[PDB]
């Protein structure tokens, strides 16, 4: 039959067997839809043995209802009841299976998208899920609409114990192959249920998946904006965070998992350094709110930074580069004050020249989600003496008289090779500036000489890596020897 027996009174849609809960020392949301005047019983269960009792009602001109669990310790399984008694009548569900663990939410658009079966070493990728089975795995459908949803409208697939088949369930369809590997690293370190929830839509700007709130702050046009070819996919101001994302709003997180930008490379790219960290708080404002407070306030928002790909002909190469600036803030790391409690993952030297997916779509994600595992061992988990930064210079002097740049790392740093190019100096002179190579000169084991001679003028900033495509499959130039991270992208000033 198309119907239920049971209509009235369900769970909300994020609420299924097989799911994951947060754990300690947060208290799990569970929240559903029922008849007015009904009294709602949630009975936390383990097998035959009652844990935990919640109660609450259904308001008078409301139809949901919703408790908060005390917190609880990663494990399992568990079974969840909740019970409707409505006057002379009950009415039951239960979702049974269910773990309590860290909670993760995938979003961003087709990097995220991009699903095991397209990565390096697919077979192997999707056959080693024995060990896993605490690992649970949740894909939201591609819905859009034009006003905040209270449930998700669609599921591609449900809470479940990863397999082969639903691993690799197609091409940018079921399972990020980024959120899988960077939940498969988080559970060989911490050893306990995870549950890692896909929502993300490839080919859109970070306005689709921005709330009404955070697009204000920033001054985002109301009438989007003219769009070229990397935009592919939905657009339009918060019609993907409508429908996709506030449904979860109310369930209790552990973090996010951010892979978007590769569409804002023409699409209102000044404003990034604004929306993207606008939407990191604005998330964690509406998160807290919709769970009760259960969700960290400041909750672990890690992101990858745009990889090294050629973007479509009518983008200026320079947005990609630029991008890459802005999700830092502008600042080339984090945390940082305008994004605190964030990791990022250093990509640029991940890219793929025989992808069959395009440039853009690197089949290397594992390294992807081991770099984004170092920064949420740190940042998410408090990890200490643990390196998840690449090396950036924290001291620049300029050698006029010797025709040379002074780099100073803050790390120690690896030099492959002697680059000419990706390093480039600001020739200023009389109010006529120019970016210029500077070829690596001679380096130390924290620092780095570029050549300025070719520079008549002033000095005024320098930058590195400022390419589309800067670097080959790990032949980036420079590197941190004991973590093998790469040096992030950076502008700097001279003064
Ligand atoms: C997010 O990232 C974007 C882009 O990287 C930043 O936007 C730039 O911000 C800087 C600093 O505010 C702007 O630089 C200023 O430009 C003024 C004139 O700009 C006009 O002309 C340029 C082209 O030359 C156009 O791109 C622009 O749209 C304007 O039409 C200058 O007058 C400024 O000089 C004054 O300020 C400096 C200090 O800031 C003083 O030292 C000077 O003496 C002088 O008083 C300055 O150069 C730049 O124009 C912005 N770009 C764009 C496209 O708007 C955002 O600032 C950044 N946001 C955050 C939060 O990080
Ligand atoms: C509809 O649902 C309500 C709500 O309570 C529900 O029943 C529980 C059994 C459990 O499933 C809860 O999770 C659930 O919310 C029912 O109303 C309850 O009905 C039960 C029926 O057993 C009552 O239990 C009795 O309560 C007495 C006062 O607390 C107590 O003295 C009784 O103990 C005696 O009987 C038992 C049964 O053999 C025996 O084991 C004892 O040793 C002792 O002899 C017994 O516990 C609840 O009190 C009721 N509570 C309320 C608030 O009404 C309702 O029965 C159910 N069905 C309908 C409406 O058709
Ligand atoms: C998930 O989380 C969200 C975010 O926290 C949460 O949204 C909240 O919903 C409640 C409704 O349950 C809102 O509170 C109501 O707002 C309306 C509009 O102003 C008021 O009219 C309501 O008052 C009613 O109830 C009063 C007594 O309770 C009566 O005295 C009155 O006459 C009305 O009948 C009430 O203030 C609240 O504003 C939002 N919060 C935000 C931040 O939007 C949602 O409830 C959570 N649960 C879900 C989605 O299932
Ligand atoms: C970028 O600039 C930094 C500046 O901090 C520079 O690091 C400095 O390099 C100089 C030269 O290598 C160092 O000076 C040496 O320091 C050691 C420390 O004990 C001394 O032993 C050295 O003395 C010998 O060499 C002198 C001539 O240089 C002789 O006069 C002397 O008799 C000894 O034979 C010498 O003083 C300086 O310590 C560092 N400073 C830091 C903080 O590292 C770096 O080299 C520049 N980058 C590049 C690529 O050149």
């Known amino acids: 039959h198309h119907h239920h027996k049971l209509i009235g009174f369900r769970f909300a849609s994020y609420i299924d067997n097989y799911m994951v809960l ?9 929240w559903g839809f029922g008849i007015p005047g009904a009294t709602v019983t949630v009975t936390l269960c383990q097998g035959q043995q009652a844990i ?13 209802w919703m408790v908060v669990l005390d917190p609880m310790k990663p494990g399992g399984p568990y079974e969840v009841m909740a019970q409707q008694s409505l006057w002379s009548r009950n009415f039951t569900v239960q979702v049974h ?11 961003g658009q087709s990097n995220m998208q991009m699903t095991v079966l397209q990565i390096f070493n697919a077979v192997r990728e999707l056959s080693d899920t024995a060990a896993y089975q605490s690992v649970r795995l949740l894909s939201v459908s591609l819905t859009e609409a034009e006003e905040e949803l209270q449930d998700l409208n669609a599921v591609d697939l449900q809470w479940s114990k990863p397999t082969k088949e639903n691993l690799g369930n197609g091409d940018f369809t079921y399972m990020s192959a980024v959120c899988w590997l960077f939940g498969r690293y988080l559970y ?8 890692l929830i896909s929502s993300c839509w490839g080919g859109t700007p970070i306005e689709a998946w921005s709330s009404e709130r955070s697009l204000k702050a920033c001054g985002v046009p109301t009438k989007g904006s003219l769009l070229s070819d990397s935009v592919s996919g939905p657009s339009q101001n918060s019609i993907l965070w409508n429908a996709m994302i506030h449904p979860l709003q109310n369930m209790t997180l552990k973090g996010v998992l951010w892979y978007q930008g590769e569409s804002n490379v023409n699409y209102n790219k000044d404003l990034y350094n604004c929306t993207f960290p606008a939407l990191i708080e604005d998330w964690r404002q509406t998160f807290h709110s919709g769970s009760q407070g259960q969700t960290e306030r400041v909750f672990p928002f890690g992101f990858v930074q745009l990889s090294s790909y050629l973007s479509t002909a009518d983008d200026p190469p320079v947005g990609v580069p630029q991008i890459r600036w802005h999700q830092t803030a502008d600042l080339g790391f984090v945390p940082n004050r305008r994004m605190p409690n964030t990791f990022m993952a250093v990509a640029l030297d991940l890219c793929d020249r025989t992808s069959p997916f395009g ?7 594992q390294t992807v989600a081991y770099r984004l595992h170092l920064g949420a061992r740190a940042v998410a988990y408090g990890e200490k003496n643990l390196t998840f930064q ?12 010797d025709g040379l740049l002074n780099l100073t790392y803050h790390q120690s740093i690896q030099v492959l090779r002697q680059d000419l190019q990706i390093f480039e100096i600001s020739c200023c002179s009389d109010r006529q500036c120019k970016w210029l190579p500077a070829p690596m000169n001679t380096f ?3 620092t780095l000489t570029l050549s300025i001679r070719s520079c008549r003028g002033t000095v005024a900033a320098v930058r590195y890596a400022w390419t589309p495509w800067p670097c080959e499959y790990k032949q980036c130039p420079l590197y941190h020897p004991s973590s093998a991270l790469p040096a992030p992208p ?6």
């Open 22 to 30: 947060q754990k300690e020392p947060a208290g799990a949301v569970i």
């Open 52 to 64: 935990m009792k919640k109660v609450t009602s259904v308001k008078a001109h409301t139809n949901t």
């Open 97 to 107: 299976d269910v773990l309590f663990g860290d909670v993760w939410l995938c979003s």
């Open 188 to 195: 060989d370190t911490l050893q306990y249920p995870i549950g």
């Open 359 to 365: 440039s853009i779509h690197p089949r290397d994600k």
């Open 390 to 401: 690449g090396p950036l210079p924290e001291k620049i002097e300029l050698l006029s008289t």
């Open 444 to 446: 130390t084991s924290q």
């Open 490 to 495: 950076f502008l700097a000033f001279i003064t």
